């Protein structure tokens, strides 16, 4: 797809022209590197919320898997792009969501200590109970870090 390649270069700097006029021209939405990434994924990484917005509006599948399990939610939530886990999850990302190695969004939120986002997730019924494939639950990471007050909510 030439067109699938430079939407997801587009995606990932944050060209919402260039974006706009791809997916007019008829990129495909749900196009992927070679990582098994949408433009969506990348755009939620980085933490481009006009352009998650604009992919979601074009019909991008909010719950696309790349090579690891990741689901644009996981990236989001790693990286602390509170404004992007809410619209994901408004469009209907799967909270628990699990990756390769069985991390929820909920594991990533805890382990860089973003509580604004973990409580987010919990409202949208994270399983605190989720084990990865290590055993470890995000309140077993929340003690691991020393981090009391996600502890306290998790």
Known sequence: SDLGKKLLEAA???QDDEVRILMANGAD????????????????RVGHLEIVEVLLKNGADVNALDFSGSTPLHLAAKRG?????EVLL??????????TIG???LHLAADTGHLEIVEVLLKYGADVNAQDKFGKTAFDISIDNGNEDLAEIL
């Open 90 to 99: 408004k469009y209907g990302a799967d909270v628990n969501a699990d990756d």
């Open 29 to 44: 939405v749900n196009a992927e590197d070679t990582y098994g990434d949408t433009p969506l994924h990348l755009a939620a």
């Open 12 to 14: 990932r700097a944050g």
């Open 103 to 105: 991390s929820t969004p």
């Open 81 to 85: 792009h509170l404004e992007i886990v």
